[PDB]
C-alpha cells in the first residue's frame, strides 16, 4: 500500500493532448442525452428501469478513452476489446446517438426491444448483434472474461495465427463488483502470463448499490494491496488538479497522513455535506492541514474534486498503463457516485442542465429534449475526428467471419464409423475425432483443445507431444492447460469460441472437463456465452451418474443435461457409440464453422467406460443428428415393446431386449437416442406451430416419425426428466422412464446401475409390467421377474437415498 | 515476498511438545493402512479408484494437528471445524480405524457404499451422516466455505448466541486447487472481518494432477505475495531441521540466494534424481554453496527435507497461527508429492513397508494386512491420550439438533391468509412472513436474513430498523449484508443452515437475491449444500422471465426451477399468492426445524410485481404444500377445459378462464400450481412404486387425484419443461404447455408476456385449439381468435428469437 494520493505526481504528468474545453462540451451533451434516455423511459411508467448515477461517476473516464485511447475494429485486428460496465450502457447509447449511429427513436425505445427498433438494457450481443460485444452485467464475469481474452490474444500472436499486439483489453469494473470471487480470483494469471495487453479500470466511487463497499475501511487500499501482491502495476487516480498546490505546499506531511487515515465512510459523508463541513471535519483535524486552506473560501474548498473526474489525471494513468510491460495494470479511479446530480444523489434536471452548462432552454427543458451537434459544428467535427484517428466507432460487432474453411467431410472420420477393433469409450472416440480434425489443413491450427488440469484422465496426454501445451510446452504449443480452474478454462473457451467475431479469425475450441463441473459450476458463464454467440464444443467427460462409479456424490453427473437444456442456443447430445460421436462432431463443425455459421455451441457428454463399438448402420447419419434412430427390432410372438437408451445405458437396454426376446418371447424395437433434448425441442416447435395454424396440416414430431405405438421404456444415466421430457410427443400410450435421480455414491458400475434402477433387469421388469397391464402376460410373470433379478421392490426411492 | 526460507527461524521455534519417535510409529501405521485401503480396493478391479500420493505428502501435517491442535466436538462448542482435503480421505479413514472408530470390514468396503457398510470416496455428510462434516472434494468450495464458516462463528459470538471463541476453522487446500477463482477470490473478507479463527493450510507440493502448478515460477511466492497483499499472516514452512546448521553456516547468503532463484520445475527435478545430481545441479551452482556441502555424503544431501515433512517446523506454524489475533493465517507447507513411495510416485509395497518401518512381516505382507495397536501398547495409549486431551475424536457429526423449538403456528400467519386490501407481491408476502417469524420468542434471534448488496430492491429495508445489520449497524446486527458476492452469501447461508448440526444450534437463514444469480451462478455450492444437509430458505427474488421486465437477457429468470429440480433434497415452489407463501414458509419451517427434522432446504421464487391478493380458500393448505389445488370452477355450456398456472402468470390464466367463459361459453376448472416439481416427483414415485408392485392396485399421482380428463392448458413464467414435467401424470388426453423458452430481453411486462406466448390470449387460443381438435368447436373460431387477439402465428419461436 502506498500513500493515498495520485501515483503519478504532476511533474511526471504528460501535457494533455486534447481540447479540454471542447471535450467537456461534448461530454456534457452525452451526460444529458443519457439522463434524457432513462428519464423518458421512466415516464412511461412500465417499470423499465435504468441507471444514471453510475455513468455520472465514470463519464469522464470513458470520455478520455473515447477521445484518446480506444481503437475501433479495423482492417488489421478487432481493435481494443472493451468490457463496458453493464449499467452505464445509457452513456454508451448517448455517445453512439451523438455519433449518428443510433436514432432518437431508438433512444426513445430504450428497454423496449420486442418490436425491433429498441435498445437492450445492457450489453447483449444476442439482442444487438452488430453493436455490443461482451455481456458484463452479471458482475464478476467481465473481469475474469477479460483476463482470459487478453491471454487468448497473446496466444494467437504466439501461435502465429494473428498479430494482435496492437490490441488492448480494457475491463471496466465497479468497486463493489470486486467482491465477486470471480473478480480477483484469477488476477494472478495476468502476472504468470505477463498480460501487458490488459488494463483493469476500477471505478472507485466507494459505493455499491445499497451502501459503501467498506465504509469502515479503504477499498482503494484493499484493491492496491491485493493487486500489487498479485504482481500487477497499480495506478491510483485519487485527486484532481486543485489538490496539487495543497499537496506541494504542505511540508509537514500532515495532509497525506490525514488522507491516509480517513476511511471511506467519512469521505462519502463529506461529499454529501458542504464546504464549511469539509473545512471543519477534514482539514480541521490538524492545525497544519487547517492552515493549508485557512485562506480559501468554503466554496473553493468545496471545488476540490476526486481524480477520476479530472481529464488530466485520467490521461496520465491510461498513458502510463500503455507503456507498462511484463504485467497487467489496474487503474483505481476515485470518483463520486451520482456526480453532479445534486440532492437527488421536476427541476432536478434543471440542476443537471445548470451544473454541466447544458445548451437546453429553460423553455424546452420540460420536453426532455435530446441534444445533437450539427454537421460542421466544432463539437461534431472534433467528436468524429478523434474517433477516426482511432479507426472508427465502438462498440461495434461483426456477426459472421469472412473466410471460407475447408472442413473435414464425414468420410474423413471414416475410421470411427466402422466397428472398432478394441472396446473403447466415447471419450476415446472424441480424441480420435479430434485427431482427424488435426490432420485437416484448413482447421488443424485453429483448433483449441482446452483442459482443466485433467488430461491423463481423458487420454489427452498423447497430445502433449503431438501439438504441445501453450506456455509463452513452449509458446507455439496448441493446448491450453488452465489447471484446476473451470471458470478460467471456460473463459479461454469463450474467447476462442467468439474469435470468429471479435478478430474475424475463427478458432474452434474443444474444452473437456469432468461433466459435473460444467454447467453446475460455471453456469452463469455458459449463459453469457450463449448471449455472446459462442460457437465451440463443451465436452462433458466422465459423465453419467453410474458410470464414474467410484467417485461419488460430488462427481457423479446425472443432471448436466437438465442444466444444459435451459440454454437456448446450446445443442446437447449424450451419444452411446463412437460413430455417433463422430457424426455429431462433424455436424457441429459444419453448422457452426461451415457456410451456415449457425450461432449455437455444442455440449457432448462422453464416457470413461470401454465397451464394444459397432459400425454405424447404413443411413443412420441424419437420425443421429436429429436425436434418435432405430437400431434394430428383435422378433418375439408373445408381445412387443419399444426400448430407448442413450449414453452408457443403451448397451444395457439392448441387453434387456435380448432377455425379453429369449426368456419371455417379447420382441422389441430398440432405439439409440443421441439427444432427448433436441427431440423435445422439435416436438415443442411442432405443437407450438400446430396451435398457431389450426387450419393447416399439423407438423409431426421427429420422435413420432421414428417410434410407433407399442408400450415403451427408456433408460439413461441421467435423472428421469432427461428422457421424460419427450413424453408429450411419444406416440405410445405407455412410456415408462428409468433414470438416475438421487445423489451419487461410490460403488461398482453394476451396483450403481442396480441401485439407481436403470440396468437391464429394471428395463425388463418395466417392459413386462406394461404388457401385464394390457393383459398380454400374467402379472405374476412380472412379479417373478422382480424376484429372479434380485430386485428389491421396497428399497427407498433412489431420489431419497 | 520474503526469502525462500522458513518464516519462523529456529531461534523463535517453540520446543516440540510430543514424543517424536512414538508419533512416527503411529503415523507409519496410519500411512500403511491408508495405502492398504486403496490397494485392496484396486485389487477388486471394479474401477473403484482412490488416491495415495497426496495423503503421503500431507500426512505429517495432519498428524501434528491430530496430536496437538484439533479440538473435537464437546459440550461447549462444536470443536475445530476441519475442512479436510477431499482426496486424502483414506488417511482419515486409516486413523479412524486405528482409533477403533471404523471396522476392518468398513475399510474393505472403501468406495462400495450401496449395500450399507462402506465408506464414501470423499467427505459426504449425506452418505456418512455421523462421520463427515464438510464436502470439500469439489475444489475451491472448501476455501470460501471455510472463510464464511469462520465469519459465521464470530457472528454467533457477537450475537450472544454461542461462545465459539475456542473454535478454529481449518481449511486444508491443495496448491493446484488455489487456481480455482473461488479459492483466493474471497480472501480479503478474512482481513475485513479480522478472522483470526481461520487457518488456511495449503499443501505446497508444487504439483497438481497432471503436472506442476507453475513449473516456470514459484507457486509458494505467488501465494505469499497475494495473501500478504490481502492482509493475511503468511507462514512459510519451507525446510526441515537439517537445513538449520547449513543456512547459518552460510555467511555469503548464497544459499538463501540459490534457494530464491530456483524455480518450481527445477526443485521437482531434483527430488527425482539423487544426492549426486543435487550436489551438482543445485549445490554445484556457486563455489560457496557447493562448498557448504563439501564435507557431506550424497546420502546426507539426499537426506535434506522439505519443511512440510518436519513436525518441529509444522508445530511452530500452527502454534504461531493459534496465537495470532486480528487477521487470518495461511500456512504454506512445502512437501513432496508421493513422499516415500519411491520408484512409483509387491515390490512397491515392500518399499513402503521398509521406508516407514511398518510392523508387517514378510510372511504377512502379501495379504495386504491392516495394522492395529492393541490396548496396552505404547502406540495405542499415546494415540488415545492425545485425542482425549483434545476432547475426543474428529471428524464426527451430529445429524439432529437437540433443543426443541416452539415454532409459529399457521394461525400466526393469519393476516397473510386473508384477502389483502393493498395490491402486493409475493416478495412483500415473504418479508411479512419473516416479520411474523421475528415476533416468535423461540426463533426470532435464530433467523438469519442474508442479502447480496440489494435490500431496497427486495423491500428488505424495513427490517434494518427492526433487527439491524451485522457489522463488527453494529456487531449485534442480525442481517448479513454480503455485498456483491452471491457465492459468499451462499456460503454464509450454508454456514447458518448447518449450524444445527455443527454447533447443535439451529439457525434459520433466508437468503434473498436475484433468482437468476442463484443456482445458475452458485449451483456447485447448492449441490454441496445438499450433501451438507443444509436446512434453510433460498428466496429467488425478482423471478419469472417476463416479470423482471426491463432487465433483459442476463437477469430474466425462466429456468432456475429447472436447475433447482436437479437437487434431490431441495424443495421448490413458485407461488402466485401471499397466502401460499405463508403456508409454504410455515410448512418448510415445521419440516426442517420442527420435530421431524427433515433434511431438505427450500427454494421459493418470489415476484416484484404487485397485484390483487385474494383470501386462501378454506382447506387449501394441504394442496398448497403438495403442489396443486383447484382454485375455482367456471360454468360454460359450449365446452370444458382445465387451466393451470403458477407464479405471476396464474393471474393471466385466470383472465383467460374469464374470457373463455364470457366469449366462448367454455367453462373450466382453474388450478394454482405452487410446485410443478413436487408434483412431478410425486408422480414419479407412484409410477416407480406401481412398476415395482405389479400385483397391487396402481397408486394415483396427487395431480391426477386433483385433476380430471377435460383438455388442459398450463402457462408459467418458466420454460415449458417446468410444466411439461408432469405430463405423464396429468390424466387428460390433451395437455398443452405455454412457457417462456428463449433468452429474455427488455420490454414492458405486457410486451414480454405476448412475446413469450404465455399471456391470456395464448392460453385462450391453446384451449380453443384442443376443443376444435375434439370437434366441440369449429377450427375457424380458433383461427378467428388468433386474429382477434393480434397474435402473430408466424413470428419466430421465442426459443430461437
Ligand atoms: C438490475 O439492476 P441492478 O440490481 O441495479 C444491477 C445493474 O444488476 C446491479 S448494479 C449493482 C451495484 C454495482 O456496484 P459497483 O460499485 O460495482 O458499480 P457502480 O458503483 O454502480 O459503479 C449490483 C449489485 N447489481 C445487481 C447484480 C448483482 N449480482 C450480479 C451477479 N450482477 C448484478 N448486476
Ligand atoms: C477423480 O478424482 P481426481 O480427478 O483425482 C480429484 C480428486 O477429483 C481431483 S484431485 C485434483 C488435483 C489436486 O491438486 P492439488 O495440488 O490441489 O492437491 P494435491 O497436489 O493432490 O495435494 C483435481 C484437479 N481433481 C479433479 C477436480 C477438478 N475440478 C474440481 C472442481 N474438483 C475436482 N476434484
Ligand atoms: Mg461502486
Ligand atoms: Mg499439489
From Swiss-Prot, chains A, B:
One of its GO terms (biological process) is pyruvate catabolic process. SUPFAM superfamilies: Thiamin diphosphate-binding fold (THDP-binding), TK C-terminal domain-like. Its EC number is 1.2.4.1. GO terms for molecular function: identical protein binding; magnesium ion binding; molecular adaptor activity; protein homodimerization activity; pyruvate dehydrogenase (acetyl-transferring) activity; pyruvate dehydrogenase activity; small molecule binding; thiamine pyrophosphate binding. It holds the Pfam family PDH_E1_M. It catalyses: N(6)-[(R)-lipoyl]-L-lysyl-[protein] + pyruvate + H(+) = N(6)-[(R)-S(8)-acetyldihydrolipoyl]-L-lysyl-[protein] + CO2. It is an enzyme of class 1 (oxidoreductase). The keyword Magnesium applies. InterPro entries: PDC_E1_N (IPR035807), PDH/Transketolase (IPR051157), PDH_E1 (IPR004660), PDH_E1_M (IPR041621), THDP-binding (IPR029061), Transketo_C/PFOR_II (IPR009014), Transketolase-like_C_2 (IPR055152), Transketolase_N (IPR005474). Component of the pyruvate dehydrogenase (PDH) complex, that catalyzes the overall conversion of pyruvate to acetyl-CoA and CO(2). NCBIfam families: aceE. Homodimer. Part of the PDH complex, consisting of multiple copies of pyruvate dehydrogenase (E1), dihydrolipoamide acetyltransferase (E2) and lipoamide dehydrogenase (E3). In pull-down experiments interacts with CedA. This is Pyruvate dehydrogenase E1 component. It comes from Escherichia coli (strain K12). The lineage of its organism: Bacteria, Pseudomonadati, Pseudomonadota, Gammaproteobacteria, Enterobacterales. The gene is aceE.
Amino acid at each position: 500500500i502506498s500513500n493515498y494520493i495520485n501515483t503519478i505526481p504532476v511533474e511526471e504528468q504528460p501535457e494533455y493532448p486534447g481540447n479540454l474545453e471542447l471535450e467537456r462540451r461534448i461530454r456534457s451533451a452525452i451526460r444529458w442525452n443519457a439522463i434524457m434516455t432513462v428519464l423518458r423511459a421512466s415516464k412511461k411508467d412500465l417499470e423499465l428501469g435504468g441507471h444514471m448515477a453510475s455513468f455520472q461517476s465514470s463519464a469522464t473516464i470513458y470520455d478520455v478513452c473515447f477521445n484518446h485511447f480506444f481503437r475501433a475494429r479495423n482492417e488489421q485486428d478487432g481493435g481494443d476489446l472493451v468490457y463496458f460496465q453493464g449499467h452505464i450502457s445509457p452513456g454508451v447509447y448517448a455517445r453512439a446517438f451523438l455519433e449518428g449511429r443510433l436514432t432518437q427513436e431508438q433512444l426513445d425505445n430504450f428497454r423496449q426491444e420486442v418490436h425491433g427498433n429498441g435498445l437492450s438494457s445492457y450489453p447483449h450481443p444476442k439482442l444487438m448483434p452488430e453493436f455490443w460485444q461482451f455481456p458484463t452485467v452479471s458482475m464478476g464475469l467481465g473481469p475474469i472474461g477479460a483476463i482470459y481474452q487478453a491471454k487468448f490474444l497473446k496466444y494467437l500472436e504466439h501461435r502465429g495465427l494473428k498479430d494482435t499486439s496492437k490490441q488492448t483489453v480494457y475491463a471496466f469494473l465497479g468497486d463493489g463488483e470486486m467482491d465477486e470471487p470471480e473478480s480477483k480470483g484469477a488476477i494472478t494469471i495476468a502476472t504468470r502470463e505477463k498480460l501487458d495487453n490488459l488494463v483493469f479500470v476500477i471505478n472507485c466511487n466507494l459505493q455499491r448499490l445499497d451502501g459503501p463497499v467498506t465504509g469502515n475501511g479503504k477499498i482503494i487500499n484493499e484493491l492496491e494491496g491485493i493487486f500489487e501482491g498479485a504482481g500487477w502495476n497499480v495506478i491510483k487516480v485519487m485527486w484532481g488538479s486543485r489538490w496539487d498546490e495543497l499537496l506541494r505546499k504542505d511540508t509537514s506531511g500532515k495532509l497525506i497522513q490525514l488522507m491516509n487515515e480517513t476511511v471511506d465512510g467519512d469521505y462519502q459523508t463529506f461529499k454529501s455535506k458542504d464546504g464549511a463541513y469539509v473545512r471543519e471535519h477534514f482539514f480541521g483535524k490538524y492545525p497544519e492541514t487547517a492552515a493549508l486552506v485557512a485562506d480559501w473560501t468554503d466554496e473553493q474548498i468545496w471545488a476540490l474534486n476526486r481524480g477520476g473526474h479530472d481529464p488530466k489525471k485520467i490521461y496520465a494513468a491510461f498513458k502510463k498503463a500503455q507503456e507498462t510491460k511484463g504485467k497487467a495494470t489496474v487503474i483505481l479511479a476515485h470518483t463520486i457516485k451520482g456526480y453532479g446530480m445534486g440532492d437527488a444523489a421536476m427541476d432536478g434536471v434543471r440542476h443537471i442542465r445548470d451544473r454541466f452548462n447544458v445548451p437546453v432552454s429553460d423553455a424546452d427543458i420540460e420536453k426532455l429534449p435530446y441534444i445533437t451537434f450539427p454537421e460542421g459544428s466544432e463539437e461534431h467535427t472534433y467528436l468524429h475526428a478523434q474517433r477516426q484517428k482511432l479507426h472508427g466507432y465502438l462498440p461495434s460487432r461483426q456477426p459472421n467471419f469472412t473466410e471460407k474453411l475447408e472442413l473435414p467431410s464425414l468420410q474423413d472420420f471414416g475410421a470411427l464409423l466402422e466397428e472398432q477393433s478394441k472396446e473403447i469409450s466415447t471419450t476415446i472416440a472424441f480424441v480420435r475425432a479430434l485427431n482427424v480434425m488435426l490432420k485437416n489443413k484448413s482447421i488443424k491450427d485453429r483448433l483449441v483443445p482446452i483442459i482443466a488440469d485433467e488430461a491423463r484422465t481423458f487420454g489427452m496426454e498423447g497430445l502433449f507431444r503431438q501439438i504441445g501445451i501453450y506456455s509463452p510446452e513452449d509458446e507455439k504449443g496448441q493446448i491450453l492447460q488452465e489447471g484446476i480452474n473451470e471458470l478460467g478454462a471456460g473463459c479461454s473457451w469463450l474467447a476462442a469460441a467468439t474469435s470468429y467475431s471479435t478478430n474475424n479469425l475463427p478458432m474452434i475450441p474443444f474444452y473437456i472437463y469432468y461433466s459435473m463441473f460444467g454447467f453446475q459450476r460455471i453456469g452463469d458463464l455458459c449463459w453469457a456465452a450463449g448471449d455472446q454467440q459462442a460457437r465451440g464444443f463443451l465436452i462433458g467427460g466422465t459423465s453419467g451418474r453410474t458410470t464414474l462409479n467410484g467417485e461419488g456424490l460430488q462427481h457423479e453427473d446425472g443432471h448436466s443435461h437438465i442444466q444444459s437444456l435451459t440454454i437456448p442456443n446450446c445443442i446437447s447430445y449424450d451419444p452411446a457409440y463412437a460413430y455417433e460421436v463422430a457424426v455429431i462432431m462433424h455436424d457441429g463443425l459444419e453448422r457452426m464453422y461451415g457456410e451456415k455459421q449457425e450461432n449455437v455451441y455444442y455440449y457432448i457428454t462422453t464416457l470413461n467406460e470401454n465397451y464394444h463399438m459397432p459400425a454405424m448402420p447404413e443411413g443412420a447419419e441424419e437420425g443421429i443428428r436429429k436425436g434418435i434412430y432405430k437400431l434394430e427390432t428383435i422378433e418375439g410372438s408373445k408381445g412387443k415393446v419399444q426400448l430407448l437408451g442413450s449414453g452408457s445405458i443403451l448397451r444395457h437396454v439392448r441387453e434387456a431386449a435380448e432377455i425379453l426376446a429369449k426368456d419371455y418371447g417379447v420382441g422389441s424395437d430398440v432405439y439409440s437416442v443421441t439427444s432427448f433434448t433436441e427431440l423435445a425441442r422439435d416436438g415443442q416447435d411442432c405443437e407450438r406451430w400446430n396451435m398457431l395454424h389450426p387450419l393447416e396440416t399439423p407438423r409431426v414430431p421427429y420422435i413420432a416419425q421414428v417410434m410407433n405405438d407399442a408400450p415403451a421404456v427408456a433408460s439413461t444415466d441421467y435423472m428421469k426428466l432427461f428422457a421424460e421430457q419427450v413424453r408429450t410427443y411419444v406416440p405410445a400410450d405407455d412410456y415408462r422412464v428409468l433414470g438416475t435421480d438421487g445423489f451419487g455414491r461410490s460403488d461398482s458400475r453394476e451396483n450403481l446401475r442396480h441401485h439407481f434402477e436403470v440396468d437391464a433387469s429394471y428395463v425388463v421388469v418395466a417392459a413386462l409390467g406394461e404388457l401385464a397391464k394390457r393383459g398380454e402376460i400374467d402379472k405374476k410373470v412380472v412379479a417373478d421377474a422382480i424376484a429372479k433379478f434380485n430386485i428389491d421392490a421396497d428399497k427407498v426411492n433412489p431420489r431419497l437415498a
